[PDB]
Amino acid sequence: TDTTPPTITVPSDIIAYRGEEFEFYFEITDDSGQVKNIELSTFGKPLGLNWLEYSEDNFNVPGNATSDNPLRVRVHGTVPLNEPIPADKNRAQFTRTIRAWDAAGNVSSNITFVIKYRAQTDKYNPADPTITYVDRLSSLSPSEKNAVEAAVRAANPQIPAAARITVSANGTVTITYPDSSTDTITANRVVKDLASS
Amino acid sequence: TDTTPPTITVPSDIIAYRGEEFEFYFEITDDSGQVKNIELSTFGKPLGLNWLEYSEDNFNVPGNATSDNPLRVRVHGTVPLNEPIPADKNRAQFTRTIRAWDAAGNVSSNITFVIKYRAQTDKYNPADPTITYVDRLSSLSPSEKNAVEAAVRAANPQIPAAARITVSANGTVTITYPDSSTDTITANRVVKD
Ligand SMILES: CC(=O)N[C@@H]1[C@@H](O[C@@H]2O[C@H](CO)[C@H](O)[C@H](O[C@]3(C(=O)O)C[C@H](O)[C@@H](NC(C)=O)[C@H]([C@H](O)[C@H](O)CO)O3)[C@H]2O)[C@@H](O)[C@@H](CO)O[C@@H]1O
Numbered sequence: 001t002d003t004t005p006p007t008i009t010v011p012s013d014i015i016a017y018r019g020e021e022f023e024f025y026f027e028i029t030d031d032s033g034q035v036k037n038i039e040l041s042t043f044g045k046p047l048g049l050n051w052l053e054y055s056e057d058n059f060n061v062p063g064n065a066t067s068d069n070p071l072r073v074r075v076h077g078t079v080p081l082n083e084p085i086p087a088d089k090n091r092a093q094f095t096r097t098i099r100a101w102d103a104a105g106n107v108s109s110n111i112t113f114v115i116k117y118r119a120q121t122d123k124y125n126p127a128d129p130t131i132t133y134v135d136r137l138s139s140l141s142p143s144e145k146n147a148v149e150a151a152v153r154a155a156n157p158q159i160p161a162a163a164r165i166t167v168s169a170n171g172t173v174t175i176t177y178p179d180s181s182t183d184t185i186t187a188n189r190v191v192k193d194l195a196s197s
Numbered sequence: 198t199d200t201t202p203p204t205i206t207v208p209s210d211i212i213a214y215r216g217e218e219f220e221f222y223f224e225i226t227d228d229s230g231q232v233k234n235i236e237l238s239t240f241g242k243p244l245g246l247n248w249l250e251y252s253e254d255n256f257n258v259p260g261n262a263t264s265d266n267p268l269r270v271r272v273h274g275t276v277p278l279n280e281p282i283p284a285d286k287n288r289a290q291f292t293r294t295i296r297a298w299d300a301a302g303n304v305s306s307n308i309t310f311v312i313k314y315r316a317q318t319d320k321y322n323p324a325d326p327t328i329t330y331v332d333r334l335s336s337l338s339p340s341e342k343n344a345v346e347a348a349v350r351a352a353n354p355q356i357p358a359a360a361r362i363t364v365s366a367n368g369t370v371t372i373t374y375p376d377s378s379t380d381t382i383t384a385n386r387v388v389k390d
């Protein structure tokens with residue numbers, strides 16, 4: 001008889017950014033070559049993460065889980081935009097457990113995986129814009145602020161379109177990402193006096 | 198022998214907006230059918246409007262100023278972006294005079310014309326944007342503010358590109374024109390839950 005449960009390989013460094021779709025894979029094998037299903041939990045208790053999803057495609061099919069061709073389970077979702085990040089941002093993670101059944105009733109013992117989530121500015125590092133030349137450094141005109149915003153946007157296509165770029169009276173740039181985290185560009189790297197140049 | 202000066206028609210409503218080029222026409226007629234030249238002044242004194250210019254095309258040509266085809270003098274210019282606007286609008290204007298003469302040298306009296314000038318928001322009146330649906334009416338997200346600005350811009354190609362559109366936490370829209378005058382679009386014309 002089959003008395004050996006499936007073996008699960010977990011990803012070692014799962015990093016998610018708030019408001020951005022992410023994915024990772026579990027790889028599962030069984031000596032029988034067949035895995036019936038899995039369970040994601042909090043050490044046997046409810047998962048408690050409704051934004052976490054996975055496909056049951058190819059579950060409980062003969063030969064779906066061999067050493068040569070493991071069952072690859074795609075887990076995906078989006079950490080909510082406003083998921084709380086405490087003062088110590090290392091605390092921004094969820095430790096959860098996974099186990100799997102074979103077709104003979106053997107279930108593996110829960111093993112852990114960790115979903116770390118971070119603010120969007122942790123992912124994005126804005127390049128300085130081409131300098132906008134202005135008439136008064138202490139008081140930008142509406143067209144100068146438009147130009148600055150355009151310049152910052154142009155120098156940073158990798159930044160999400162849903163991020164909002166604002167410009168202060170002295171040309172200080174604020175980039176506010178969809179999750180409301182921010183990056184700043186100081187005025188001296190954004191604007192210069194036109195006449196002096 | 199011609200002893201009668203030309204007659205001049207001026208526009209009744211010359212309204213210029215700060216920083217934006219305006220144009221208008223004088224129409225001049227003489228009984229001879231010919232007008233030689235004109236003069237713009239401040240009741241005979243220097244005009245004092247260096248940003249105003251007019252064309253001298255077809256001056257002093259026979260037949261350039263008949264009853265049926267008057268001399269049409271194109272005037273244009275741009276009132277300074279930072280021209281101070283008096284609290285009383287009846288003083289937000291330049292009162293000036295034009296005279297003209299024919300080939301015999303008959304000169305008209307000084308005829309008054311008035312260039313009124315106004316802030317850019319007196320011209321612009323923002324159209325309604327497509328409504329943007331938001332999560333919290335009292336606290337818009339960055340993405341929702343982007344959506345709002347984009348909608349206001351898309352609905353208003355006639356507003357200067359140089360105008361800056363800002364969005365507050367509650368979806369109130371401020372449009373700041375190049376001359377720093379403003380319009381406001383109330384939140385309830387902008388966002389919905
Ligand atoms: C509630 C309880 O006592 N559960 C224990 C459980 O303890 C968990 O053990 C994990 C390591 O195996 C972590 O130490 C868990 O702490 C964390 C995590 O999930 O990594 C710390 C994070 O900072 C925190 N995240 C936030 C945003 O605060 C999370 C969070 O509180 C929960 O994961 C959300 O539900 O927790 C720690 O809670 C473990 O020891 C098992 C062993 O059987 O026993 C109980 O279930």
Ligand SMILES: [Ca+2]
Nearest residue numbers: 002004031102
């Ligand atoms: Ca087995």
Ligand SMILES: [Ca+2]
Nearest residue numbers: 121124125183
């Ligand atoms: Ca950053």
Ligand SMILES: [Ca+2]
Nearest residue numbers: 199201227299
């Ligand atoms: Ca005459």
Ligand SMILES: [Ca+2]
Nearest residue numbers: 260261266267
């Ligand atoms: Ca003619």
Ligand SMILES: [Ca+2]
Nearest residue numbers: 318321322380
């Ligand atoms: Ca207006």
Ligand SMILES: [Ca+2]
Nearest residue numbers: 318319320321
């Ligand atoms: Ca008006």
Ligand SMILES: [Ca+2]
Nearest residue numbers: 149165346362
């Ligand atoms: Ca903008």
